[PDB]
């Protein structure tokens, strides 16, 4: 009976009361010592949740756009592609940039074969691995060939086809009911996924980390504000009456720290929004994982941190390298949660900074512990991003 009241509780309300239970909870634990009880007892459940945001990117990812891309014109699908991506490698510039300045202030391969594995070399075996990038292009070219076979004159080419647009639809409508019934487990997640990290972060809490988080988070502010509002009042969107829309997505978004968790929702702020289906259908699943801004973002002033940490110096050029490459190197892969630390682990790696030195294990396992809450933002700014490159993408 009890379990009853608790699905029928509206579902961003319990994201939020795990949210603050669990950190409440956290820094109790934070003073009163336990900090390995929880990691042990509590953490798992906060896992499961991770592994659950984790589980929905590749089918989303493929069932979705598929759908997306072919249930528009091949020619549409152009405008709006090239506008959406347009849109976030202006941002991603603009993010990469607002990054490095707040690292600054607070102060705390080649390039093609990155582009060639866009194209996979084996469809199923990008779905088998979690490369996104290149499941995105075999799903956005399945999308219009679906197209053109619903078009073909021959009857039994049409029926086939049809045939496989709904078998993947229904694929694409399945992965959006389990992400409902995610969010449901979500508060009990968050809480637990909060939890942990609150309570082993509740010293250090004026440490150096303390200045990452803030470069980090007013960074997010400088990127919605300097960056997304900007835009929009360029394009004639007012933006507090979009951010009003857009509430529950930014909410569900910056709590939930998958983006792809958080689509069906977003999907549902921009159908209120007016903008025309067919376009956030599309962008928006694209967008989940696409985005860049938020993670170059993150890498701009984390990076920064470690290079501090084994007391190195970056000149502007060279950091900058350092965070476009890791930005470049990951186009897509950023709607899984905890992006930030996974990302960052290579980025070491790519340098010659291995983890298996201890001061830098040492340095990353200190951002790893703030990952929790720096990659809660980070997913703000995504999941705002994409939600705005819709919007402007509308026009």
């Given at each position: 009976?009890?379990?009853?009241?608790?699905?029928?509780?509206?579902?961003?309300?319990?994201?939020?009361?795990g949210?603050?239970?669990?950190?409440?909870?956290?820094?109790?634990?934070?003073?009163?010592?336990?900090?390995?009880?929880?990691?042990?007892?509590?953490?798992?459940?906060?896992?499961?949740?991770?592994?659950?945001?984790?589980?929905?990117?590749?089918?989303?990812?493929?069932?979705?756009?598929?759908?997306?891309?072919?249930?528009?014109?091949?020619?549409?699908?152009?405008r709006?592609?090239?506008?959406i991506?347009?849109?976030?490698?202006?941002?991603?510039?603009?993010?990469?940039?607002?990054?490095?300045?707040?690292?600054?202030?607070?102060?705390?391969?080649?390039l093609?074969?990155?582009?060639?594995?866009?194209v996979?070399?084996?469809?199923?075996?990008?779905?088998?691995?979690?490369?996104?990038?290149?499941?995105?292009?075999?799903?956005?070219?399945?999308?219009?060939?679906?197209?053109?076979?619903?078009?073909?004159?021959?009857e039994?080419?049409?029926?086939?086809?049809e045939?496989?647009?709904?078998?993947?639809?229904?694929?694409?409508?399945?992965?959006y009911?389990?992400?409902?019934?995610?969010?449901?487990?979500?508060?009990?997640?968050?809480?637990?996924?909060?939890?942990?990290?609150?309570?082993?972060?509740?010293?250090?809490?004026?440490?150096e980390l303390?200045?990452?988080?803030?470069?980090?988070?007013?960074?997010?502010?400088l990127?919605?504000?300097?960056?997304?509002?900007?835009?929009?009042?360029?394009?004639?969107?007012?933006?507090?009456?979009?951010?009003?829309?857009?509430k529950?997505?930014?909410?569900?978004?910056?709590?939930?720290?998958?983006?792809?968790?958080?689509?069906?929702?977003?999907?549902?702020?921009?159908?209120?929004?007016?903008?025309?289906?067919?376009?956030?259908?599309?962008?928006?699943?694209?967008?989940?994982?696409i985005?860049?801004?938020?993670?170059?973002?993150?890498?701009?002033?984390?990076?920064?941190?470690?290079?501090?940490?084994?007391?190195?110096?970056?000149?502007?050029?060279?950091?900058?390298?350092?965070?476009?490459?890791?930005?470049?190197?990951?186009?897509?892969?950023?709607?899984?949660?905890?992006?930030?630390?996974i990302?960052?682990?290579?980025?070491?790696?790519?340098?010659?900074?291995?983890?298996?030195?201890?001061?830098?294990?040492?340095?990353?396992?200190?951002?790893?512990?703030?990952?929790?809450?720096?990659?809660?933002?980070?997913?703000?700014?995504?999941?705002?991003?994409?939600?705005?490159?819709?919007?402007?993408?509308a026009?």
């Open positions: 009976g009890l379990y009853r009241k608790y699905i029928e509780y509206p579902v961003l309300q319990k994201i939020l009361i949210l603050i239970l669990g950190a409440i909870v956290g820094l109790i634990l934070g003073h009163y010592g336990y900090a390995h009880a929880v990691h042990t007892y509590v953490k798992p459940f906060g896992d499961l949740f991770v592994r659950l945001l984790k589980m929905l990117v590749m089918p989303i990812v493929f069932a979705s756009l598929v759908v997306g891309a072919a249930s528009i014109s091949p020619a549409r699908l152009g709006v592609g090239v506008k991506v347009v849109y976030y490698l202006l941002t991603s510039a603009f993010a990469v940039t607002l990054g490095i300045i707040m690292a600054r202030l607070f102060n705390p391969p080649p093609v074969h990155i582009l060639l594995d866009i996979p070399t084996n469809p199923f075996g990008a779905l088998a691995n979690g490369q996104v990038l290149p499941t995105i292009f075999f799903a956005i070219i399945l999308g219009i060939a679906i197209t053109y076979l619903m078009n073909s004159e021959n039994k080419v049409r029926k086939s086809a045939t496989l647009l709904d078998a993947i639809n229904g694929l694409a409508e399945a992965m009911k389990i992400v409902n019934g995610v969010m449901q487990y979500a508060p009990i997640g968050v809480f637990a996924l909060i939890a942990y990290v609150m309570a082993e972060q509740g010293v250090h809490v004026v440490g303390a200045k990452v988080t803030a470069a980090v988070y007013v960074g997010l502010t990127q919605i504000l300097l960056v997304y509002f900007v835009l929009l009042k360029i394009y004639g969107i007012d933006p507090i009456s979009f951010i009003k829309h857009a529950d997505a930014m909410l569900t978004a910056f709590v939930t720290r998958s983006s792809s968790g958080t689509l069906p929702v977003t999907m549902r702020v921009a159908k209120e929004m007016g903008i025309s289906e067919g376009i956030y259908s599309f962008t928006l699943p694209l967008g989940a994982t985005n860049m801004d938020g993670t170059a973002l993150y890498q701009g002033v984390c990076t920064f941190f470690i290079a501090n940490a084994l007391g190195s110096h970056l000149t502007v050029g060279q950091q900058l390298t350092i965070v476009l490459t890791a930005v470049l190197a990951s186009i897509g892969t950023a709607g899984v949660p905890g992006a930030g630390a990302m960052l682990a290579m980025v070491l790696h790519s340098v010659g900074l291995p983890l298996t030195d201890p001061n830098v294990a040492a340095a990353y396992a200190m951002i790893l512990g703030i990952d929790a809450i720096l990659d809660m933002g980070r997913t703000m700014v995504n999941v705002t991003g994409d939600l705005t490159g819709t919007a402007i993408v026009k």
